[PDB]
Design a protein around this ligand. Sequence first.
Ligand SMILES: Nc1ncnc2c1ncn2[C@@H]1O[C@H](COP(=O)(O)OP(=O)(O)OP(O)(O)=S)[C@@H](O)[C@H]1O
Ligand SMILES: Nc1ncnc2c1ncn2[C@@H]1O[C@H](COP(=O)(O)OP(=O)(O)OP(O)(O)=S)[C@@H](O)[C@H]1O
Lengths: 569, 557
Amino acid sequence: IRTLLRLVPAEKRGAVAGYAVLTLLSVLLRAVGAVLLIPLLAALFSDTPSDAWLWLGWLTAVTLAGWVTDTNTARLGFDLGFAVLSRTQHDMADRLPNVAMSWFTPDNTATARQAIAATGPELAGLVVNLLTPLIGAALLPAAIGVALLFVSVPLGLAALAGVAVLFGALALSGRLSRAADKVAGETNSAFTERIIEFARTQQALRAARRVEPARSQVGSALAAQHGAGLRLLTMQIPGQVLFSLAGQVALIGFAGMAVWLTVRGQLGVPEAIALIVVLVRYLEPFAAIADLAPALETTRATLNRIQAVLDAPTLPAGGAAPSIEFDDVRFSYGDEVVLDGVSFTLRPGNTTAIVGPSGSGKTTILSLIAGLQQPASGRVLLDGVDVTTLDPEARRAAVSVVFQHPYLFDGTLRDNVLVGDPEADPDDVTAAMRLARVDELLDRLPDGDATVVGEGGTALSGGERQRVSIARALLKPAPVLLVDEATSALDNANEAAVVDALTADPRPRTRVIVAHRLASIRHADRVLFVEAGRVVEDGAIDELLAAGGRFAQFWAQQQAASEWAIGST
Amino acid sequence: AEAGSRLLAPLKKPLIVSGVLQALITLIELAPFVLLVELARLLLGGAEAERLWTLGLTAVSLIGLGAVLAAAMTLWLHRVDARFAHELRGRLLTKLSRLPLGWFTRRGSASTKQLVQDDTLALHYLITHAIPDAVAAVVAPVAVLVYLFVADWRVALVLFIPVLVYLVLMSVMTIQSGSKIAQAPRWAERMGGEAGAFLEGQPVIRIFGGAAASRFRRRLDDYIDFLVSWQRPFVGKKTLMDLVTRPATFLWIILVAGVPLVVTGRMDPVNLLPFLLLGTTFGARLLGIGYGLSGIQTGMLAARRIQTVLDEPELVVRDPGTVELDRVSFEYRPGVPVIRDVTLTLRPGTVTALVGPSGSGKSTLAALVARFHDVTQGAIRVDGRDIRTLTADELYRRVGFVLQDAQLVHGSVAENIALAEPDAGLERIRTAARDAQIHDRITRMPDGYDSVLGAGSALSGGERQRVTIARAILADTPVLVLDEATAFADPESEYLVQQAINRLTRDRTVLVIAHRLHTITHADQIVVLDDGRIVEVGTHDELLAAGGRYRGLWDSG
Ligand SMILES: Nc1ncnc2c1ncn2[C@@H]1O[C@H](COP(=O)(O)OP(=O)(O)OP(O)(O)=S)[C@@H](O)[C@H]1O
Ligand SMILES: Nc1ncnc2c1ncn2[C@@H]1O[C@H](COP(=O)(O)OP(=O)(O)OP(O)(O)=S)[C@@H](O)[C@H]1O
């Protein structure tokens, strides 16, 4: 795999060169240790075994050299494995904040989580557990085959061709094995896919009293599919049997060829036995590759994940209230379109209040305003400057956001609040906590503003989490304050905090609120009713109410809904 | 431990026969490495070509027999595996139709997906691959050792030098690193959780930035340093242990122990050939036992999970809509009460609201009312009959429920609405949909009422909830457990769902699980729960006048 050349750090390139040359030396020494069995066993089986001492001395000298080179390569392997683990992990961790948000699809999120989490021990010992044995076992049959040219041209040539034949057999065996595993997984998933539907709809089937017909139907379907399911996996039989049979047939071929050359007189009987033994050394590495094949597959999967994360797209580079303006902006989550020629302008300082149906691109519009994503077409302007051309520091310093989810981390409530502006003085922090009505939560907490807000530290409910999120947003000195509402009716103090944020905040900054209830948009200077990704009504509150349009219907629905009570009309 | 074996009890004899066949196949696999020793015995004798042709025939026959036996054994094993797996899926199907409905709302345990799809596949791999592979990996080294000892015990003993040194270094490394290897999985799951948190909180880093990245980077650096400090001091032990078991070292030991014997005449030179053929790779063969044992362990864990499922406690059947709770007490986990001696009487036609703080256990009592679980103490009577003596159909034609996370069944919209009463005509389905404030949207869909629903469709949450409410309207259940969170599940369509619930609560003994206090002031009864026990009961006015916990909750609202 060629990705490893990029993964290894630049300061360890000399270690890579030393590892490569020492691995070639190790394979050469093992080949000489194996090919030295030809004269050694020729002398041992002869009528004067005393001649075997010299070749045994040479063999044990080669074995000592092999031990020295092998321990050197093992030391280099541990060093390089730890180094490449550190380099890959740090590069992956630094890359992700710069990765564009469009890349974070749930499958991509899963792959990145797997790459960060499960790649510690594997990449730690990758180069020692996999690369060195794999390279040794791959090159040693070729080394012995080439080295046997001098002993016998036809025998060496046949062994060298057998290298290619047996590697082809290994590749075919791997193909059939993984294909059979895929087929097995597919049939199991197909059989159980109806049990998942039976378990998912168990409440609906039980309550509707259809559990007995549904269960009988599922069982009959399983039986019917199993009746025809006895024809599967005809290609699993040559999965591993094919490779072992190929290896044993190659062994019999080499032994028979040695016997034939003995009959033809080109080789002596002792050297024929020695060649049988050496050509059994020749086939021995191929078993090691087959044993290492699953680990190679897992390593290939992990390296594919690391390559996918490392190749993710990157965002290009480039205190009064800005005027946020849209010019035919279009955006799409792949193929589905979320905006279509949306164009509007927000006056600086006027608290715009986006509203509309769900899945209409409200949160998407806020995200494009905040620069999390970019417009697939058109422009997103902040005071006439395109958002894409903003500097990264200016990109961070321009917009503050309250997300739908709170996005809190384990730690003190205070430290959560300061991330809006860690250099902020205590006065600004107190102002932010008051405007967010976090001081009421401080009475609840035992340790005050230093209380840990992690799940293991303190289990805060939705209202408290949203209040600290509002404090985070208010603390930061961003000239734009987006408030993507996720306000819960279980906490009226959250609604009061949002109203204070849109009203009590003294900083003169434009604000955009994506609201569900009428508690917040009462103080809206203008409204954008966004339906199906296109602004259908725009204007002031009272203007839209007088017009009797869609926003008037929405106002009537929400106002009537707030006065709802069960058991009376 | 016995649970894992109990699932595979009927496959005792087939597994033993498969193991015997695999032992035979492995012994046949090593046959040519004995025929080669016989060939060396034969060539040195210089016998006729016939005595070598017969040996070639024997080798060809043995490899062919090995291939045929492997094919037949894997065919038979796959057939038996399919036969058993179909039975297992049939037995899991019935269990899912008799586990209590609360079992499916579990947490802290594997989902049904991993539990039926992945674990059954793991059992398939256990039966077909892991057991035969492990039997092979155990039979091969034992047979090789026996053959080498039969050849010449003097040279067979020196192969215990590298093997025993490998064992000694392995044991020293294991005991020296017991604490770290015990602690390693905790670090792994901690880093996995931290990586998930770092990926989840990406937008905050995008806008706010700050120390969010450094917090994860410190954890990553600590994990890398932990791995390095764990494995760095064991570089020497690991590399020496790797060197000792290599085939080249075995070959050198074999020759150094054999040439002195052969040259001195104490050993036949042919008797050394078994060691050079089979014994040199003995280290890799002994290293392979652990892989097979790991495979068996991985399969048996899945067997354990499935058997733990098949022995869950399934719902026992013992023996004008009024519901009586009589000294009810419930414990999800033993020794951890969640409901403690609650008494109630949902009078007929009275909307008995249920209210309390988060984590008070108010949803649990409604769950017991619908018999999502069985009350450990006391009894719950519906119409004067204990729910525990009511079969499922008789219970659920009396006590319906409209709870959170409404589920749709694969079929037409006229099937989802008419699941309770499929025989209801299309006009009855239409007027039920009108009552649920969903007839407007259904007619807007292209196929109309025949549109196929399922895992995913064109309807959002606030529309499938109204479809389920239409189903509950058409079921005509006198009692009705209700989760008030469905009102604001989709805040856009709150008004329509509220109209649907108002129509659903017409003349039914309803038990509203109230989260919002202001939607209860007209309730004929209110129950204040905390810590799993009833505190204050009465109407809105009486509870407020009492100056109790309800007044505090109302003021906080
Ligand atoms: N990560 C995502 N992957 C795929 N589709 C998405 C994703 N996020 C949003 N969508 C879809 O994009 C469309 C627009 O959704 P949003 O941008 O959230 O607009 P929205 O109306 O504010 O959504 P909600 O429900 O009100 S939060 C909808 O069809 C969403 O289902
Ligand atoms: N299966 C369970 N295992 C362990 N604890 C459980 C289980 N089910 C409920 N609990 C406990 O029961 C308490 C909450 O009861 P629930 O009725 O499930 O939730 P809740 O009280 O209704 O929360 P809300 O916000 O009021 S709906 C907590 O202490 C939970 O830990």
